[PDB]
Every structure is written in C-alpha cells, then in structure tokens.
Short mmCIF file of C-alpha atoms in Angstrom, two decimals:
data_model
loop_
_atom_site.label_atom_id
_atom_site.label_comp_id
_atom_site.label_asym_id
_atom_site.label_seq_id
_atom_site.Cartn_x
_atom_site.Cartn_y
_atom_site.Cartn_z
CA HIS A 171 52.33 -38.20 36.17
CA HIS A 172 49.64 -40.89 36.38
CA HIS A 173 46.85 -39.30 38.45
CA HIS A 174 43.92 -38.52 36.18
CA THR A 175 40.28 -39.41 36.78
CA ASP A 176 40.01 -40.70 33.20
CA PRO A 177 41.80 -44.06 32.85
CA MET A 178 42.24 -43.48 29.12
CA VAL A 179 44.15 -40.29 29.85
CA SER A 180 46.16 -42.09 32.53
CA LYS A 181 47.25 -44.76 30.05
CA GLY A 182 48.74 -42.25 27.62
CA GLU A 183 50.28 -40.05 30.29
CA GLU A 184 51.98 -43.10 31.82
CA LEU A 185 54.01 -43.75 28.67
CA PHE A 186 55.36 -40.18 28.65
CA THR A 187 56.25 -39.69 32.28
CA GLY A 188 59.93 -38.96 32.39
CA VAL A 189 62.44 -38.60 29.60
CA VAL A 190 61.89 -40.83 26.56
CA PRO A 191 64.61 -41.61 23.98
CA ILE A 192 63.80 -40.76 20.38
CA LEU A 193 65.09 -42.18 17.09
CA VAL A 194 64.30 -40.47 13.78
CA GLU A 195 64.96 -42.00 10.37
CA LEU A 196 64.21 -40.23 7.12
CA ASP A 197 64.71 -41.40 3.55
CA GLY A 198 64.24 -38.63 1.05
CA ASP A 199 64.34 -37.90 -2.63
CA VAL A 200 64.07 -34.27 -3.79
CA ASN A 201 64.25 -33.75 -7.56
CA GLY A 202 66.17 -37.03 -7.75
CA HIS A 203 68.73 -36.07 -5.07
CA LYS A 204 68.49 -39.05 -2.70
CA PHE A 205 69.43 -38.59 0.92
CA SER A 206 68.95 -40.05 4.36
CA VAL A 207 68.83 -38.45 7.79
CA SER A 208 69.25 -40.10 11.18
CA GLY A 209 68.38 -38.35 14.41
CA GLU A 210 68.71 -39.18 18.09
CA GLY A 211 67.71 -37.46 21.28
CA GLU A 212 65.12 -37.32 23.99
CA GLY A 213 61.70 -35.91 24.69
CA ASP A 214 60.20 -34.70 27.96
CA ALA A 215 56.46 -34.19 27.52
CA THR A 216 56.15 -32.70 31.01
CA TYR A 217 57.88 -29.59 29.66
CA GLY A 218 56.97 -29.99 25.99
CA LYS A 219 60.67 -30.30 25.30
CA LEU A 220 62.56 -32.15 22.58
CA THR A 221 66.33 -32.20 22.18
CA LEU A 222 67.54 -33.85 18.98
CA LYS A 223 70.63 -34.05 16.81
CA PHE A 224 70.18 -35.00 13.17
CA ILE A 225 72.88 -36.21 10.78
CA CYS A 226 72.74 -36.44 7.01
CA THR A 227 74.11 -39.95 6.51
CA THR A 228 74.54 -39.68 2.72
CA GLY A 229 76.82 -36.63 2.65
CA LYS A 230 75.64 -33.05 2.06
CA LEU A 231 71.95 -32.41 2.68
CA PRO A 232 70.49 -31.22 -0.66
CA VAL A 233 67.85 -28.99 0.96
CA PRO A 234 68.16 -26.51 3.86
CA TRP A 235 67.84 -28.03 7.33
CA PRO A 236 65.11 -25.57 8.40
CA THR A 237 62.80 -26.97 5.73
CA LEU A 238 62.88 -30.34 7.45
CA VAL A 239 62.11 -29.25 11.02
CA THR A 240 58.37 -29.90 10.87
CA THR A 241 58.92 -33.28 9.17
CA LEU A 242 61.68 -34.51 11.50
CA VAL A 243 56.91 -35.98 17.02
CA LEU A 244 53.89 -34.26 18.45
CA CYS A 245 53.33 -36.79 21.23
CA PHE A 246 55.92 -34.79 23.21
CA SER A 247 53.72 -31.69 23.22
CA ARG A 248 52.83 -30.43 26.66
CA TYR A 249 49.09 -30.62 27.12
CA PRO A 250 47.90 -28.69 30.19
CA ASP A 251 46.03 -30.79 32.74
CA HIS A 252 42.64 -29.37 31.79
CA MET A 253 43.32 -30.27 28.13
CA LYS A 254 44.67 -33.82 28.52
CA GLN A 255 41.40 -35.32 27.21
CA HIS A 256 42.28 -33.70 23.86
CA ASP A 257 45.72 -35.30 23.41
CA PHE A 258 45.24 -37.48 20.35
CA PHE A 259 48.96 -38.06 19.94
CA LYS A 260 49.61 -39.82 23.22
CA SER A 261 46.29 -41.68 23.13
CA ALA A 262 47.36 -43.48 19.94
CA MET A 263 50.42 -44.93 21.72
CA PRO A 264 52.12 -47.30 21.94
CA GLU A 265 50.75 -48.72 18.67
CA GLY A 266 51.28 -45.29 17.17
CA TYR A 267 50.01 -43.13 14.37
CA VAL A 268 50.65 -42.18 10.78
CA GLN A 269 51.48 -38.56 10.00
CA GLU A 270 51.04 -37.48 6.35
CA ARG A 271 51.80 -34.07 4.93
CA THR A 272 51.98 -32.14 1.74
CA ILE A 273 54.14 -29.01 2.04
CA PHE A 274 53.88 -26.47 -0.79
CA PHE A 275 56.76 -24.03 -1.09
CA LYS A 276 55.36 -20.88 -2.65
CA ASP A 277 56.70 -20.42 -6.20
CA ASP A 278 58.73 -23.61 -5.79
CA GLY A 279 58.27 -27.37 -5.34
CA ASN A 280 56.50 -29.50 -2.80
CA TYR A 281 57.33 -32.18 -0.26
CA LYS A 282 55.07 -35.16 0.34
CA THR A 283 55.82 -37.02 3.56
CA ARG A 284 54.55 -40.12 5.28
CA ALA A 285 55.76 -41.08 8.70
CA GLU A 286 54.98 -43.76 11.26
CA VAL A 287 55.41 -42.72 14.88
CA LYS A 288 55.40 -45.56 17.39
CA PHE A 289 57.28 -47.17 20.25
CA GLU A 290 59.91 -49.85 19.65
CA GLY A 291 60.44 -51.02 23.18
CA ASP A 292 61.24 -47.95 25.28
CA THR A 293 62.24 -45.85 22.28
CA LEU A 294 59.91 -43.56 20.39
CA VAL A 295 60.64 -43.93 16.67
CA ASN A 296 59.67 -41.58 13.86
CA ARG A 297 60.21 -43.30 10.48
CA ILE A 298 59.71 -40.99 7.50
CA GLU A 299 59.63 -41.16 3.71
CA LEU A 300 59.89 -37.83 1.87
CA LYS A 301 59.37 -37.17 -1.83
CA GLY A 302 60.04 -33.72 -3.23
CA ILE A 303 59.23 -32.64 -6.77
CA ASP A 304 59.06 -29.58 -9.00
CA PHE A 305 61.78 -27.60 -7.21
CA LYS A 306 63.74 -24.89 -8.98
CA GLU A 307 67.48 -25.56 -9.15
CA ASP A 308 68.26 -21.91 -8.40
CA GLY A 309 65.33 -21.34 -6.04
CA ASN A 310 65.59 -20.81 -2.32
CA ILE A 311 65.45 -24.51 -1.45
CA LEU A 312 67.86 -26.23 -3.82
CA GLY A 313 69.87 -22.99 -3.92
CA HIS A 314 70.34 -22.97 -0.12
CA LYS A 315 69.19 -19.38 0.35
CA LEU A 316 67.44 -19.83 3.70
CA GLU A 317 68.70 -18.62 7.06
CA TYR A 318 69.55 -21.23 9.68
CA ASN A 319 66.75 -20.39 12.12
CA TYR A 320 63.05 -21.02 12.75
CA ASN A 321 60.27 -18.60 13.65
CA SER A 322 57.82 -19.29 16.48
CA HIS A 323 54.29 -20.07 15.33
CA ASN A 324 50.91 -21.41 16.38
CA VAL A 325 49.11 -24.26 14.61
CA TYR A 326 45.43 -25.12 14.84
CA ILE A 327 44.46 -28.77 15.37
CA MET A 328 41.02 -30.08 14.43
CA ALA A 329 39.45 -33.49 14.70
CA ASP A 330 38.68 -35.54 11.64
CA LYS A 331 35.98 -37.79 13.07
CA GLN A 332 35.56 -39.74 9.81
CA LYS A 333 39.20 -40.85 9.88
CA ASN A 334 39.34 -41.21 13.67
CA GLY A 335 42.21 -38.74 13.55
CA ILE A 336 43.19 -35.13 13.21
CA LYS A 337 43.86 -32.61 10.51
CA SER A 338 45.80 -29.41 10.48
CA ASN A 339 46.82 -26.85 7.90
CA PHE A 340 49.28 -24.09 8.64
CA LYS A 341 51.87 -21.77 7.15
CA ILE A 342 55.56 -21.73 8.04
CA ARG A 343 57.57 -18.67 7.02
CA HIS A 344 61.23 -19.43 6.37
CA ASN A 345 63.64 -16.51 6.44
CA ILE A 346 65.59 -15.90 3.20
CA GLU A 347 69.14 -14.56 3.58
CA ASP A 348 68.15 -11.30 1.84
CA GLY A 349 65.53 -10.50 4.49
CA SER A 350 62.55 -11.81 2.54
CA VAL A 351 60.45 -14.87 3.38
CA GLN A 352 59.78 -18.24 1.77
CA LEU A 353 56.30 -19.50 2.58
CA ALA A 354 55.75 -23.20 3.19
CA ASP A 355 52.06 -24.17 3.30
CA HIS A 356 51.53 -27.36 5.27
CA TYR A 357 48.60 -29.75 5.01
CA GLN A 358 48.63 -32.49 7.61
CA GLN A 359 46.57 -35.51 8.59
CA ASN A 360 47.18 -38.08 11.30
CA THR A 361 45.46 -41.43 11.76
CA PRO A 362 45.94 -44.16 14.36
CA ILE A 363 47.77 -47.35 13.52
CA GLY A 364 45.92 -49.43 16.07
CA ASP A 365 42.24 -50.24 16.06
CA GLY A 366 41.60 -49.14 19.64
CA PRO A 367 39.89 -45.94 20.71
CA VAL A 368 41.70 -42.63 20.62
CA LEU A 369 40.99 -39.21 22.08
CA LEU A 370 39.51 -36.95 19.42
CA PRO A 371 40.20 -33.31 20.33
CA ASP A 372 38.13 -30.22 20.34
CA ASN A 373 39.71 -27.46 18.28
CA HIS A 374 42.85 -26.07 19.90
CA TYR A 375 46.31 -24.92 18.94
CA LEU A 376 49.93 -25.89 19.48
CA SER A 377 52.46 -23.15 20.14
CA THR A 378 55.92 -24.03 18.87
CA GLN A 379 59.38 -22.58 19.26
CA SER A 380 62.59 -24.06 17.90
CA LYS A 381 66.25 -23.17 18.31
CA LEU A 382 68.66 -24.50 15.69
CA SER A 383 72.35 -24.86 16.44
CA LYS A 384 75.52 -26.64 15.41
CA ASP A 385 77.78 -29.11 17.21
CA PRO A 386 81.27 -27.55 16.96
CA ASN A 387 82.93 -30.99 16.98
CA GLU A 388 80.75 -32.45 14.20
CA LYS A 389 82.17 -32.64 10.67
CA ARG A 390 79.11 -34.32 9.15
CA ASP A 391 76.27 -32.17 7.83
CA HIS A 392 73.91 -31.91 10.78
CA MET A 393 71.35 -29.94 12.80
CA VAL A 394 70.97 -29.66 16.56
CA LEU A 395 67.36 -28.90 17.47
CA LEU A 396 65.75 -27.71 20.69
CA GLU A 397 61.99 -27.65 20.27
CA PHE A 398 59.19 -26.69 22.65
CA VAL A 399 55.55 -27.46 21.83
CA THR A 400 52.68 -26.47 24.15
CA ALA A 401 48.96 -26.94 23.67
CA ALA A 402 46.60 -24.05 24.35
CA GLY A 403 43.34 -22.45 23.33
CA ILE A 404 40.83 -24.18 25.58
CA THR A 405 39.99 -22.16 28.68
CA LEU A 406 40.12 -24.04 32.02
CA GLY A 407 37.09 -26.09 33.04
CA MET A 408 33.55 -24.84 33.60
CA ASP A 409 34.69 -21.20 33.59
CA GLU A 410 37.51 -19.11 35.10
CA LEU A 411 38.32 -20.03 38.70
CA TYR A 412 40.07 -16.71 39.43
CA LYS A 413 37.20 -14.22 39.07
#
C-alpha cells in the first residue's frame, strides 16, 4: 500500500503494490561450459513471495540448479511496516541497482556474478553475467552431487555508506547426496544505478526459505522456485507496545 508518512518510502512501496511480473536472464560460463538461463514469474512484496520458473536455454545445465538460487531479486522481500525506512532495494527503483557477488565453494571453484536489477516498463528484470573458475571436474558442482533442495537461512544486511549501498556476507550450505554438506561462502555488494537518494539501512537480516520443484510437463532442463524473503531484526518503534 501507499500510506506512509515518509514520501520516500511511499514512492518505493507504490511500485511494489500488487503482483509484479519478473524476467530473469543469465549468461554463464563455468570452466568454459557456456550456458544461458531464462526465467519468468511474478513477485508479491506484500507477502515476500516470488514464484519463478527457470529454463536452461542452451541444453543441459552444467552446474546444479540449487547453486544458482541466490544468483537467479531482493526488492520483493517483505519489509515490516516499522522497517520500511530500511528497504534499500525498493528505494533504488525504478532506475535499479547492481548486485555483485563472489561465491566461494569450499574445496572447489568460485562464481563471480554481476547483475542489473531494474524495471523495463511494468516488468522487473534481473540481467546477470556469471563467470565460474577453478572447479573440479569430479567435485560436487560439476559432478552434480547436490540434492535438489534448499535450506532455510538468515542473512545479515549492512549499509556501505561510502558506496551508497549495502554489503552482505553469508554462508549457504548445500546438501550433498551422501548426507554431507557443500559450503558456499557468499560476498555481496549492491549499489544504485541512479544518482538519486536511496534508503541506507540499519543492520538487519533477511530470513529466506525456498522450495524447489519440477514441472512434470517440461522436457527442458529447468527449476521451479517458490521463494519467501522477510526482513527482521529491528524491534518495533520506540520500544515494545505490548508490555
């Protein structure tokens, strides 16, 4: 909804009232295996909810789909009302923001990603380039030894006032089919594309859950993703209103 006392908050909330269509495009190269992914779906920031289907448009995906979840749109996070002044991601819209990561897979290779997230008309677009190097051919990634699932996790967000943006580092644990875990250490920075002001947040976290599934009628290599992302970690207003 639109009704906030801060007109800067109102501007960003306005763009994300209702269901917004999403397009995702990724071009990737991991150890010289070139691939492309296209995704479509919709986001509903009121509930923190994304529903997306991704297709590998070059044939078989050379890495496991779960390793691409975090790469393949944090403006759809649900920020509670008392935290809306800390929503960097919507405040950068519609001009958008850049999201850069390095992801280190423990005892394996790394991904470097750069994405632009912005509106094209009514559609929110996430355009990504991914470069992966130093992977082991018989490791868990190029060897496809990961389970097709995704563990819930919390991620801390901090301002980077020098870059007028945010930074975040966090660990993802991917499940290996033998019951072990493959760690993926993420380093992330985001910066605005426009030159206007943005909301720089106090420290807080995002709580994320994802469900991965398959489309039984789809013969192409693909992933169906339901993702929820909710902001938390700042207590109400002046204090607690219920004591």
